[PDB]
Structure 1
């Protein structure tokens, strides 16, 4: 019956990305004073399914110039990995007890953007190619610092296994120990997921919906959907990794009741970022990283390498 467990992991999350869309227009609406979607609800609630139906019902043309195979395979990979990254996530009990699933989170995250590269390559359009390319730039440029700071915050939990990361937070929370790395992790999740100030992949006014343009109905729904999969997912990831909680094994549910709060509390923040800052432009986007984030990530890294020895505080896990 493991299969029904998996299905039980995949349906609720898709429902969550739909209602995530709706919340996005809501909050992001009230920042603007204007109310968000409302009339169709009554509280808007029925909207996202009407939305998705509007999409899938609508004709999804196969472009004349595009090669078709890449053009179809890319969205598939997008939702694929967007969902697959969810499996080893301790809530509290992981669906899979990977010995080193964090590293796996990095693996999925790193194959993610490759789909963007195909998405813009097979699309054949000028905007497609240029936007896709700059997209891959910002992405990788952030995955390096990404993985380093994640390393440095992992020296002290003990090991790459995720469940232990609960155990190592049975009191103080990791964040008080190494918040600056939490900042850089936050922003790196704010760019790797391609979000608000780090907005370039969509391009928007800069490049009229970026790479995603030539995709029409359903595949567009897939990239859109998968994008929100990554946003909520890196949010949850940050939540478990920098914000611990009380956990009685006899009542696991209690913990989850807490956890969705602590993660939702993050996701909303991205939206409340979106309502706040103009995008960086491709120079500065990479400037602040290579010039400014990174060296601190290193100095902090040696520092965190060095605390366990000076403090004689080396974490247990073999």
Structure 2
């Protein structure tokens, strides 16, 4: 229904300087994506907390609210209410700036996830490449948290956070190059409007590549070494007490949600009940919008579910067993996939 048009025209009817009107529509989706991001964090926390109890014949929170619905609310409000402590020789500027640096770009990368056509913020012609770029800023914040702490116990485990995050960006890049072949570019709308009746069937290998490189962004118990609670307590996090630890926590879960939404838009699509949709008009547009949003969230939820379900199925790996995936299983296979897709697009340019 082009809500931008009516918002600007109704607001341009009582004046308000039409350029200013186009300026004043900016913050609405820019904060709506923050709303759904925070909600996705709350949902991811509650989901992990209840499914990690289902796996174990356990029952998660039910005394917080009805079903633990208000558990991360309690967590966040507490961590606001907690004291913050700045240890003895730690720096004052870098300590309270590390978590901001590792948290910000994950939010900033929500300017590309569609949720529906013309239902996103500012489709960039670069798109996913900007995500691959902004994701490489996190190790700076992690090394900042390591250096800005007298805790050798922390820095010894903050360098290995800039060893895996600096290792699973190359195949993460190659698996999306393999999609940039097909889709005439890099914009998400172009990656997905190429699906009108999915890339997973034609990228059976790059799926594993992207999906192993996304889980291994210092997130999950298959690796999550920099928070290896048993190996060395909380790594770089153990001196962060109040809302700063909440920033780290938030950042992990919101990055997981972003990975799920991004696998959805890349390989499956944030539309397309798998029949060739649009074969069957504002009252119909508001229906297909809801349908596309719903199916997007279905696939994102399935990937969040599988991701949390590996956390309780897959014991961790030291650091050498880890880095012998990168450069020895993900990078050669990503190169092979790239060359394969290139050769097939050269021979069979149809279907790509």
Aligned-CA RMSD value = 1.6
Per-residue CA deviations over 1:60-100 (Å, capped at 9, x if unaligned) read 11112210101111122233212111112212132111011
**TM-score, normalization by structure 2:** 0.85
Task: State the alpha-carbon separation in 2 of the partners of residues 168 and 11 from structure 1.
Answer: 29
The reply to whether residue 301 of structure 1 matches residue 327 of structure 2 is no
Aligned to 1:226: 251
SS at 1:60 equivalent: coil
Match of 1:207 among 220, 229, 232: 232
The reply to whether residue 84 of structure 1 matches residue 108 of structure 2 is yes
Task: State the alpha-carbon separation in 2 of the partners of residues 164 and 12 from structure 1.
Answer: 23
Task: State the alpha-carbon separation in 2 of the partners of residues 131 and 258 from structure 1.
Answer: 39
Aligned to 2:12: none
Task: State the alpha-carbon separation in 1 of the partners of residues 29 and 206 from structure 2.
Answer: 35
SS at 1:160 equivalent: coil
Aligned to 2:165: 139
Per-residue CA deviations over 1:31-81 (Å, capped at 9, x if unaligned) read 111111112222111221111112111111111221010111112223321
The reply to whether residue 291 of structure 1 matches residue 328 of structure 2 is yes
Aligned to 1:268: 305
Are the equivalent residues in 2 in contact too, given 1:79–1:226 (CA < 8 A)? yes
**Closer/same/farther in 2, CA of residues 80 and 312 from structure 1, 3 Å limit:** closer
Are the equivalent residues in 2 in contact too, given 1:190–1:196 (CA < 8 A)? no
Aligned to 1:184: 209
Aligned to 1:258: 295
Task: State the alpha-carbon separation in 2 of the partners of residues 148 and 192 from structure 1.
Answer: 16
Runs of 4 or more above 6 Å deviation: none
Are the equivalent residues in 2 in contact too, given 1:198–1:285 (CA < 8 A)? yes
Task: State the alpha-carbon separation in 2 of the partners of residues 288 and 157 from structure 1.
Answer: 28
Aligned to 2:221: 196
**Closer/same/farther in 2, CA of residues 312 and 150 from structure 1, 3 Å limit:** closer
**Closer/same/farther in 2, CA of residues 15 and 300 from structure 1, 3 Å limit:** closer
Aligned to 1:126: 152
The reply to whether residue 217 of structure 1 matches residue 217 of structure 2 is no
Residue 233 of structure 1: how far off its partner (Å): 0.3
Per-residue CA deviations over 1:125-149 (Å, capped at 9, x if unaligned) read 1121111101110111111121122
Match of 1:115 among 141, 154, 173: 141
**Closer/same/farther in 2, CA of residues 236 and 193 from structure 1, 3 Å limit:** farther
Aligned to 1:67: 91
Match of 1:175 among 194, 200, 223: 200
Are the equivalent residues in 2 in contact too, given 1:134–1:201 (CA < 8 A)? yes
Per-residue CA deviations over 1:224-266 (Å, capped at 9, x if unaligned) read 1011110110111001111134254923222111111111110
**TM-score, normalization by structure 1:** 0.94
Residue 124 of structure 1: how far off its partner (Å): 2.7
Are the equivalent residues in 1 in contact too, given 2:127–2:186 (CA < 8 A)? yes
The reply to whether residue 165 of structure 1 matches residue 202 of structure 2 is no
Aligned to 2:315: 278
Task: State the alpha-carbon separation in 2 of the partners of residues 32 and 109 from structure 1.
Answer: 34
Are the equivalent residues in 1 in contact too, given 2:179–2:191 (CA < 8 A)? no
Are the equivalent residues in 1 in contact too, given 2:218–2:226 (CA < 8 A)? no
Are the equivalent residues in 2 in contact too, given 1:307–1:313 (CA < 8 A)? no
SS at 2:136 equivalent: helix
Task: State the alpha-carbon separation in 2 of the partners of residues 238 and 222 from structure 1.
Answer: 24
Q: Structure 1 regions of 5+ residues with no counterpart?
A: none
Aligned length: 314
Residue 180 of structure 1: how far off its partner (Å): 1.0
Task: State the alpha-carbon separation in 2 of the partners of residues 188 and 210 from structure 1.
Answer: 21
Match of 1:95 among 111, 116, 121: 121
Aligned to 2:36: 12
Task: State the alpha-carbon separation in 1 of the partners of residues 112 and 260 from structure 2.
Answer: 15
SS at 1:206 equivalent: coil
